[PDB]
Design a protein around this ligand. Structure first.
Ligand SMILES: CCCCCCCC/C=C\CCCCCCCC(=O)SCCNC(=O)CCNC(=O)[C@H](O)C(C)(C)COP(=O)(O)OP(=O)(O)OC[C@H]1O[C@@H](n2cnc3c(N)ncnc32)[C@H](O)[C@@H]1OP(=O)(O)O
Ligand SMILES: CCCCCCCC/C=C\CCCCCCCC(=O)SCCNC(=O)CCNC(=O)[C@H](O)C(C)(C)COP(=O)(O)OP(=O)(O)OC[C@H]1O[C@@H](n2cnc3c(N)ncnc32)[C@H](O)[C@@H]1OP(=O)(O)O
Ligand SMILES: CCCCCCCC/C=C\CCCCCCCC(=O)SCCNC(=O)CCNC(=O)[C@H](O)C(C)(C)COP(=O)(O)OP(=O)(O)OC[C@H]1O[C@@H](n2cnc3c(N)ncnc32)[C@H](O)[C@@H]1OP(=O)(O)O
Ligand SMILES: CCCCCCCC/C=C\CCCCCCCC(=O)SCCNC(=O)CCNC(=O)[C@H](O)C(C)(C)COP(=O)(O)OP(=O)(O)OC[C@H]1O[C@@H](n2cnc3c(N)ncnc32)[C@H](O)[C@@H]1OP(=O)(O)O
Lengths: 265, 259
């Protein structure tokens, strides 16, 4: 019940129903217009209090953090997801943004560092192949030249069931490579700001991707995407880059939506 | 001489000459490096340390901060001094990026929120028209419908010369409206993330823009730019948008380079 409250009013702060700077509903109140019990509602009003998006304490009651003015300290947090959480449009708007700016830093990458861009995309493709076609995550790790550092980024010690944990580990490794593709290409634009954006969001990226790429169909789609990214780069027809990235954004988004109606909770 | 040192070291923590991953060389062959007394090298090495990009110490080889992993700290903290140390291409990369994403979120704004967007640009344009065409900042502020709220953000008195104070006040005000243009349009894309980006850089924006818009020709250029944005939005011809913004980027970038 807490997770639902969590996500409801979080995404109500985002979509401006409980605007930044407003006083949040006193509480008697807020449990009908959330529609859940309040032992749980303020176990999550303190959860929510400050993971960094509400105010605490006694006499004057609770408003939401900031209007924003400027404290960029801890604004992404808690954080996120999957989307049993927020993501709302937050993660989906971030993803929309990734689709938005990707043709930019990738057009750059393909022009200034054709070189590297091809070297990276080829690397990523090769690795994802050895990942998804190994009969095990342990097999994959056994034959991978980069086993040790993968292990210093990829870990799972919250799932005991080996087969499930291994499915999860493969997902994490694939996200690892998706991130590699985007982050490296972004840094190979020549304008560092893009790469920095990816580095600052790497946690959020890691979790969301760990989730999104538990879907085989996602992994496949992504792998073909990486592929004609490479083809476009090699060919020089950087007029097809935004088509490719847009259609990818579309198909990936439709999968995102298919992991939504489906499945559990 | 101190600022030169500070910025040199900054702007190649930037390009990786001492990449985020390096241990910084001993200080004397740094005075072989590019020629300031280093009595004060250590004053600016610690200067950068304080401001958050080098770490100082016990016995050491003093190495510079994390290398990135986050802390995203507030590494705007803010040796965005203004950007004399430096616009490196940090500010210019931000500017290039601004140019980069502007046609996108402005295309969104003009599509989903045509009338509101038009309204924002008409606002900004009218305010700036009344701005540069007034015989003084004092006149402008006297007849301005938004005086109290301009004054709540635009203020400057560390300058004694009344007339110069009036020029810098004009500059700060024009920057105020430029920011309004970009930030409002970005928040009117429909994806709040853009607007938040501008909000997160608003300090840096405000400075860089204050100085940049201390130039009359900059202000003029900006105003015709705003106008062509408006015309493009009104026409429905959202295909001229990356064109227009590109031209702005070029001309402004040229002015930015000191012309
Ligand atoms: C909206 C989001 C919110 C965020 C805020 C945004 C708003 C404003 C934005 C920002 C604020 C503005 C104000 C702040 C400004 C502050 C600036 C600064 O502080 S300084 C910046 C410098 N930043 C750097 O990153 C430089 C360093 N550059 C790099 O590191 C390169 O990019 C690099 C190395 C990552 C890419 O180079 P490669 O293409 O050659 O990649 P390879 O080096 O070969 O691989 C690295 C590792 O990966 C392994 N690897 C390679 N292939 C692999 C494979 N197939 N599988 C697994 N591992 C593999 C290798 O074994 C290797 O290991 P082994 O590095 O030695 O530990
Ligand atoms: C600056 C900050 C950058 C942030 C990025 C950092 C990275 C993220 C970091 C942390 C998050 C964690 C992520 C980890 C990732 C690993 C796991 C995954 O890969 S999950 C991927 C699953 N797929 C999705 O989630 C779909 C994302 N959404 C999209 O890709 C797009 O929204 C898409 C393709 C679904 C289309 O949505 P539409 O709203 O943008 O476009 P429409 O509604 O269909 O068409 C209407 C208008 O769109 C405009 N439009 C489209 N593109 C435009 C553009 N580039 N510029 C301006 N306007 C554009 C056009 O004006 C068009 O209107 P007219 O054609 O005139 O009628
Ligand atoms: C390192 C860099 C950091 C970057 C950060 C990374 C990016 C993203 C990364 C990770 C995501 C993490 C996500 C967590 C975030 C935590 C919080 C949240 O979840 S979101 C909270 C913010 N949300 C909003 O701000 C909603 C959008 N904001 C607005 O819309 C503005 O507040 C608003 C309403 C002011 C602008 O929209 P209008 O078009 O409606 O403008 P009007 O309502 O007319 O307000 C104009 C004001 O200016 C005056 N004004 C109007 N015309 C004027 C004129 N011509 N001259 C001067 N003043 C004028 C008006 O009189 C008025 O003043 P008067 O304060 O209301 O009294
Ligand atoms: C996601 C992060 C978002 C962050 C956003 C941050 C926002 C701001 C926040 C905080 C910062 C504070 C900001 C305060 C702002 C307030 C005050 C102001 O307004 S200051 C305004 C000063 N303006 C600049 O500094 C210009 C910025 N730079 C640019 O806009 C670009 O660099 C630009 C447009 C100047 C150049 O862009 P290109 O890289 O696309 O152009 P090329 O690289 O030179 O090449 C283009 C192609 O076209 C040809 N070409 C170039 N020039 C040509 C010509 N004149 N004729 C024909 N062909 C040409 C070239 O040969 C080249 O060919 P081939 O594609 O390589 O094959």
């Amino acid at each position: 019940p807490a997770g639902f409250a969590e996500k409801y009013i979080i995404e109500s702060i985002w979509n401006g129903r409980f605007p930044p700077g407003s006083i949040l509903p006193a509480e008697r109140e807020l449990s009908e217009l959330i529609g859940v019990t309040r032992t749980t509602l303020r176990e999550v009003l303190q959860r929510l209090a400050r993971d960094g998006w509400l105010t605490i304490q006694h006499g004057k009651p609770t408003k939401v953090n900031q209007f924003m003015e400027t404290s960029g300290l801890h604004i992404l947090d808690t954080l996120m997801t999957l989307d049993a959480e927020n993501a709302t449009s937050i993660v989906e708007d971030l993803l929309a943004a990734r689709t938005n700016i990707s043709p930019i830093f990738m057009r750059y990458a393909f022009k200034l560092n054709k070189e590297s861009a091809e070297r990276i995309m080829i690397n990523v493709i090769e690795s994802c192949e050895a990942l998804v076609n190994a009969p095990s995550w342990d097999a994959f790790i056994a034959a991978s030249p980069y086993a040790e550092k993968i292990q210093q980024h990829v870990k799972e010690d919250s799932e005991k069931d080996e087969l499930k944990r291994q499915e999860i580990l493969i997902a994490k490794t694939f996200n690892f490579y998706d991130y590699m593709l985007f982050q490296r290409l972004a840094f190979h634009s020549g304008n560092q700001i893009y790469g920095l954006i990816f580095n600052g969001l790497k946690k959020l990226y890691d979790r969301v991707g760990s989730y999104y790429f538990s879907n085989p169909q996602a992994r496949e789609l992504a792998m073909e995407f990486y592929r004609q990214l490479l083809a476009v780069c090699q060919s020089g027809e950087r007029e097809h880059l935004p088509q490719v990235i847009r259609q990818y954004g579309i198909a990936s988004g439709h999968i995102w939506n298919q992991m939504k109606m489906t499945l559990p909770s």
